[PDB]
Design an enzyme around this catalytic site. Structure first.
Site, short mmCIF file in Angstrom:
data_model
loop_
_atom_site.label_atom_id
_atom_site.label_comp_id
_atom_site.label_asym_id
_atom_site.label_seq_id
_atom_site.Cartn_x
_atom_site.Cartn_y
_atom_site.Cartn_z
N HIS A 153 0.83 -1.20 0.00
CA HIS A 153 0.00 0.00 0.00
C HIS A 153 0.86 1.26 0.00
CE1 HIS A 153 -2.90 3.00 1.62
NE2 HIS A 153 -1.90 3.30 2.42
N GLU A 154 1.88 1.29 0.87
CA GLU A 154 2.78 2.44 0.90
C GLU A 154 3.55 2.57 -0.40
OE1 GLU A 154 1.09 3.43 4.19
OE2 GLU A 154 2.63 4.69 3.26
N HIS A 213 1.35 4.14 -2.85
CA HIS A 213 1.33 5.58 -2.58
C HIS A 213 2.60 6.26 -3.10
CE1 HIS A 213 -1.88 5.92 0.86
NE2 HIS A 213 -2.41 5.78 -0.34
N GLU A 267 -5.05 7.94 -2.18
CA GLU A 267 -5.64 6.80 -1.49
C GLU A 267 -6.55 5.98 -2.39
OE1 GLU A 267 -4.94 5.79 1.48
OE2 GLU A 267 -3.89 7.49 2.39
#
Length: 1277
Positions: A923-924, A927, A947
């Site tokens: 997820h990071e 991002h 997001e």
């Protein structure tokens, strides 16, 4: 005719005369007057070839050179032969000039300049050449070299080219009042001061016409920093430049206005025109009144910035103060008029500012910024509200990447400043025995026999043979006793030193045997193997004990927290010395001071004097700078004690500065220079920059990394530098090369942008924390682990995982090691998957390196779980003391949540090694690099935020049993575990996904099954359900357009789920009406309105019959992800999903007519209609048609071919074996019965209507049954 052997000074560069009249040594350079009565003087001869020599004087007399008072002075030594006028004299005799009349003005030298300016500050002054500022004595607490008010009234340099003032360490003019300095340059500024500092001057009170001033160098301050002038009052700076680091990371709590060019612009006619500042400025605001603006900063009273350019980097720790790229606090303390505030015009700032705006920090309605420009760079903002979140600032004018096209804002670039004094070696010919072919060989032996006659040199050079390796260019050698690098000669001269390592210019090391053969008390001699060549150390073996017994006791009585150290450094009593991290090594060097001090006195200079004048001079030099000497000795020993095999360079870097050449420097002088260099230079964070300033340009090396590579070439040859790095460091380094053979071969090489080695990544350019190498070399124990995989570089501490279950020793190390290995394997598998999927040649950009720091929240053994104690700094943990602290990266470190700053990923709560670490890792990473890596190359869609692409789109599922549509790219879970119950995910990544076509096929089959189940449920809805039940069972989704702060346009749509009316509920009688009326199941989707940029993921089994086509710019979030997955089911990732969310069809919109004002610029608006008309031009005209055709294709599919091997229990705890659904009719009947059961007696309490609901049970059972039927999702027909 063999000649005699004597001591001879050859490359005598210059000679100086010192005295001991008043007990303090000084330079009697000129005007010796009458010959002195007593001869306590000592001559210091500085050579360009080797180090200086101190020899006591013998006779000072007067001789008429040409009828003038030119004193002839003859020095006394043992056997000193000087070649004067092609003949040899038995004593060193030299003449001293009377005086040079250059002090009438300030043209020539800086030492004369500071004297001349102080006489009459007003007037006109011109520089004569590039002048060094090292001649001035700085002063104990002097503010500036020139102390008068208005100085340098017309200090121009138009007389000849351009001259630069090299090596500044304090402000130049202190103040300026109606004085114009023009065409002046400063090349190596290292200014450090407590109060307000300025490179040119601290203040400009009146009209000071600053012009054509280019300043380069590092400026460090506390109470306030300024690029050129700390404060400019009614003064104008035009066509100036700045290009150096600016640091204000001290914990001061006052109102300072730090600026890359000028600190404070307060004048009405004050102006900055055609100026540029490349400022990699770092500062910690800590209070709202602080301002960091790069260009200027807190501009007040109508000061107008015209045609400025800021291309540096701003790294504010916290966003407390008003920090901005090109203009700080434009508002004024008085009345807030639009005109009285300040003005900007035609300004550009492509500065990677963090925690602040790109142009102006404080933005208000009556903006006077006029025209501004900024490029596409990082402008992250750490809002640190609850869970740590990072967002873009959006408060600047945005432009493309054509900065060079818009670089005509400031046409003036730079000028070619003249270099300083060369002072070359000026390198014998026509001696007793000479040969032409052996010329270089003579030089190659001159390094072996210093302080010897040229006749002996050529006599020993004739003895060299061709078979030996002395025919290459040779640098200075190093004597060593069994890999020890011996320096104290007088202690180890009687013991036969074992080896002499000759270091040739080919970066080759050759070892010769040594024996204490010929013995002289004056100068030690040695023999070199069977060749018979003579070697002698470069020291006269004087009485070191007389100096030691004197200087050691005074050096012993020093404290780290004393006032003497704090005064020697540039530290105010408020700030602490915790950032140095040298206390332990300070004490350690304090105990064993004897050995280091003896080595220093041995390697310093050659004392050929039995008189105590030279030893007294050494004593005075060591005593006067005791604090600086001790600080340098602590710093050099702390960060430079890493072994090359069995050779420790702590002795080869601190001492023996001639190993790379350049023997003119003295190891004592560099220590004094490093000690008094200031607080910022000795700072642990700047270890890579400290070498280039203090150690480099003196040891003969260009940079720290080149020095390490040179030492790896000399010591420990034929081995890769990364291998030596992995062997020497005590951090647990785990590297995982991807399974693909191509990338596995590409990573093996040492090439930049491709090597997986930790040293090749850390030492590479464009790396933020390249200073992490020197601390990591000096780790005492296995305290930190480095997970270096493809496209990552995670640093973690062992104390992060220490708790009650894991003891401090034996268990913690093994657990951390194994979990780090598994995490490296998982990250490597994830990037293998993402490399296999991306086939648009953007996979070659999957090699960027971004660090992965942890939480800093170390947990003691008493802590039950992972402790939340932040442990800011100065902690007792060895990981924080020997790392992280030295590599000072001040993070937010909140209790929960992980945030990706755009250049790195930080784990504040989720532990990196845990299996939940990878689910947050992906997820990071989404991002971090979604703009140019995961997408085809185009940026994110204008409406969709950061997001959107991560939580519900490109991420591994949070849990295996999670009923969400995601791709299991990381976690590998075997069937042996108990997680087989409710799999609902991919069994094995990098096996199921071998190409983009494999991902498309997997998603296609998954959505085929999903569409079959959703169509069955829908047919259950319209046919067998009452109206009142239909109202609660379904909801209506729409798109509402709301105003957003970042962009003016409201074209962006937000999804809203609402309870549908009974009138619309009654109309829902056809399955096509379900798609048309935009309805969705209320089983898993809440009845409240959704928000943009939210953690919303579409459920796997919750149907969304709606095809909510948003004819405007952006669909939303809940509908966006669903339509994106449907498009991925329709067309491939690159063909379908990417054009939907990566606005690659933006330009076409700009050609059509769809436009939007983004950050003040006209840009294309990619609407859903355009995406539909370009992806499927002829197939579909409306998204409803696309959804209906997908459903119809799935219907025609399952009407014909459906596997009869479906085993779904859907029963309580008593095990149910098999329901064997053979045709879709029985499955539809079961779905009708399940929907009716869910409608009858609905709980709708305590939330969670996904486990108790029988409809979800049947879908999950059928999904798991079909998933376990085949190996994986291959084909459902």
């Amino acid at each position: 005719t063999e000649p005699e052997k004597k001591l001879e000074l050859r490359n005598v560069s210059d000679i100086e005369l010192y005295s001991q009249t008043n007990g303090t040594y000084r330079q009697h350079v000129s005007l010796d007057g009458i010959p002195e009565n007593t001869d306590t003087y000592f001559v210091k001869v500085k050579s360009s070839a080797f180090k200086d020599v101190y020899i006591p004087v013998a006779s000072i007399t007067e001789e008429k050179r040409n009828g003038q008072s030119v004193y002839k002075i003859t020095a006394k030594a043992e056997k000193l032969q000087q070649e004067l006028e092609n003949k040899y004299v038995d004593n060193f005799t030299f003449y001293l000039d009377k005086k040079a009349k250059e002090e009438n003005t300030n043209f020539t030298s800086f030492s004369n300049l500071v004297k001349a300016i102080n006489q009459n500050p007003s007037g006109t002054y011109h520089l004569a050449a590039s002048l060094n500022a090292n001649e001035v004595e700085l002063g104990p607490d002097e503010r500036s070299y020139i102390k008068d008010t208005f100085t340098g009234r017309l200090i121009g340099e138009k007389d000849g080219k351009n001259y630069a003032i090299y090596n500044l360490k304090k402000p130049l003019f202190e103040n300026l009042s109606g004085a114009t300095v023009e065409k002046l340059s400063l090349k190596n500024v290292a200014i450090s001061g407590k109060n307000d500092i300025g490179s040119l001057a601290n203040e400009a009170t009146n009209g000071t016409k600053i012009k054509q001033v280019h300043v380069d160098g590092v400026l460090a301050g506390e109470r306030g920093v300024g690029g050129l002038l700390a404060k400019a009052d009614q003064s104008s700076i035009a066509e100036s430049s700045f290009k150096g680091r600016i640091v204000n990371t001290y914990e001061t709590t006052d109102a300072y206005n730090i600026g890359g060019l000028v600190g404070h612009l307060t004048g009405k006619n004050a102006s900055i025109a055609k100026s540029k500042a490349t400022v990699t400025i770092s500062s910690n605001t800590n209070r709202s009144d602080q301002t960091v603006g790069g260009l200027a900063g807190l501009v007040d009273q109508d000061a107008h910035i015209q045609n400025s350019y800021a291309e540096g980097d701003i790294n504010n720790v916290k966003h407390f103060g008003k920090v901005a790229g090109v203009a700080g606090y434009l508002w004024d303390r008085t009345s807030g008029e639009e005109k009285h505030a300040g003005e900007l015009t035609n300004v550009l700032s492509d500065v990677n500012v963090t925690n602040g705006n790109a142009i102006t920090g404080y933005h208000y309605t009556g903006m006077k910024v006029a025209n501004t420009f900024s490029s596409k760079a990082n402008r992250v903002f750490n809002v640190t509200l609850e869970k740590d979140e990072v967002v873009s600032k959006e408060s600047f004018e945005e432009r493309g990447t054509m900065l060079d096209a818009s670089q005509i804002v400031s046409k003036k670039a730079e000028i070619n400043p003249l270099t300083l004094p060369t002072v070359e070696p000026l390198s014998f010919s026509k001696i007793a025995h000479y040969q032409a072919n052996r010329a270089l060989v003579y030089k190659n032996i001159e390094k072996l026999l210093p302080f010897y006659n040229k006749s002996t040199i050529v006599k020993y050079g004739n003895l060299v043979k061709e078979n030996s390796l002395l025919y290459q260019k040779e640098l200075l050698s190093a004597v060593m006793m069994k890999d020890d690098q011996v320096i104290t000669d007088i202690v180890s001269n009687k013991q036969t030193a074992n080896k002499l390592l000759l270091h040739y210019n080919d970066h080759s090391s050759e070892k010769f045997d040594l024996k204490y053969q010929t013995d002289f008390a004056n100068l030690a001699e040695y023999n070199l193997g069977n060749t018979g060549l003579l070697y002698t150390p470069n020291q006269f073996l004087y009485d070191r004990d007389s100096i030691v017994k004197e200087v050691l006791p005074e050096l012993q009585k020093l404290d780290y927290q004393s006032d003497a150290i704090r005064k020697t450094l540039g530290i105010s009593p408020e700030v602490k010395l915790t950032e140095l991290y040298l206390e332990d090594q300070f004490s350690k060097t304090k105990q064993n001071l004897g050995d280091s001090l003896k080595k220093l006195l041995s390697a310093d200079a050659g004392l050929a004097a039995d008189n105590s004048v030279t030893r007294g001079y050494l004593v005075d030099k060591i005593k006067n700078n005791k604090e600086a000497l001790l600080l340098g000795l602590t710093y050099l020993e702390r960060w430079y004690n890493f072994n090359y095999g069995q050779v420790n360079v702590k002795d080869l870097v601190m001492y023996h500065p001639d190993f790379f050449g350049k023997g003119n420097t003295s190891p004592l002088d560099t220590l004094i220079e490093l000690g008094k260099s200031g607080f910022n230079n000795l700072l642990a964070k700047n270890n890579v920059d400290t070498y280039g300033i203090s150690l480099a340009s003196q040891h003969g090396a260009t940079d720290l990394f080149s020095t390490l590579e040179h030492y790896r070439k000399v010591f420990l040859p034929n081995t890769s530098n990364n291998d030596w790095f992995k062997s020497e460091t005590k951090a647990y380094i785990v590297e995982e090369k991807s399974t693909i053979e191509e990338v596995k071969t590409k990573q093996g090489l040492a090439g930049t942008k491709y090597s997986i080695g930790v040293y090749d990544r850390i030492t590479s350019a464009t790396w933020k924390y390249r200073n992490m190498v020197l601390p990591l070399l000096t780790l005492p124990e296995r305290s930190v682990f480095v997970i270096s995989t493809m496209s990552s570089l995670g640093f973690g501490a062992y104390d992060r995982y220490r708790s009650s279950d894991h003891k401090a020793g034996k268990a913690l190390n093994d657990f951390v090691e194994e979990n780090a290995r598994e995490t490296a394997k998982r990250q490597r598998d994830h990037y293998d998957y993402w490399y296999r999927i991306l086939d648009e040649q953007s996979r070659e950009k999957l090699y960027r390196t971004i660090l992965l720091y942890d939480a800093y929240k170390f947990g003691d053994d008493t802590t039950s779980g992972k402790a939340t104690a932040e442990a800011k700094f100065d902690s007792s943990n060895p990981a924080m003391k020997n790392f992280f602290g030295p590599v000072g990266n001040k993070v937010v470190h909140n209790q929960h949540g992980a945030y990706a700053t755009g250049d790195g990923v930080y784990y504040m709560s989720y532990r990196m090694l845990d299996k939940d670490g990878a689910i947050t890792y992906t997820h990071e990473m989404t991002h971090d690099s979604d703009q140019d890596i995961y997408l085809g190359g185009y940026g994110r869609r204008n409406g969709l935020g950061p997001e959107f692409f991560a939580k519900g789109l490109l991420q591994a599922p949070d849990q295996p049993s999670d009923a969400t549509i995601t791709i299991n790219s990381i976690l590998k879970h075997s069937k042996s575990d108990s997680t087989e119950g409710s799999r609902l995910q991919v069994l094995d990544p990098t096996e199921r996904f071998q190409n983009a076509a494999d991902l498309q096929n997997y998603v296609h089959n998954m959505f085929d099954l999903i569409y079959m189940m959703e169509y069955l449920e829908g047919q259950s809805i319209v046919n067998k359900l009452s109206v009142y039940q239909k109202m609660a069972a379904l909801r209506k989704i729409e798109n509402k357009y709301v105003k957003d702060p970042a962009d003016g346009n409201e074209v962006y749509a937000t999804n809203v789920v609402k309870e549908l009316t009974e009138a619309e509920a009654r109309n829902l009688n056809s399955f096509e009406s379900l798609i048309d009326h935009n309805i969705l199941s209320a089983r898993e989707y809440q009845s409240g309105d959704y928000e943009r940029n939210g953690y919303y993921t579409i459920k796997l089994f919750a149907p969304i019959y709606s095809a909510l086509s948003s004819e405007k710019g952006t669909p939303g979030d809940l509908m966006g992800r669903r339509i994106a997955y449907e498009l991925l089911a329709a067309k491939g990732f690159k063909d379908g999903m990417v054009p939907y969310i990566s606005n690659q069809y933006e330009e076409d919109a700009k050609q059509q007519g769809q436009t939007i004002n983004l950050y003040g610029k006209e840009r294309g608006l990619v609407t859903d209609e355009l995406v539909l008309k370009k992806v499927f031009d002829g197939k579909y005209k409306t998204w409803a048609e696309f959804k209906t055709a997908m459903y119809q294709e799935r219907v025609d599919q399952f009407g014909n071919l459906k596997q009869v091997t479906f085993k779904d229990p859907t029963k309580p705890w008593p095990s149910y074996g098999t329901k064997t659904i053979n045709n879709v009719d029985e499955l539809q009947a079961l779905m009708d019965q399940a929907v009716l059961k869910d409608a009858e007696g609905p709980r709708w309490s305590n939330y969670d209507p996904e486990i108790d609901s029988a409809v979800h049970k049947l879908k999950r059972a059928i999904f798991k049954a079909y998933l376990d039927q085949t190996n994986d999702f291959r084909s459902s027909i």
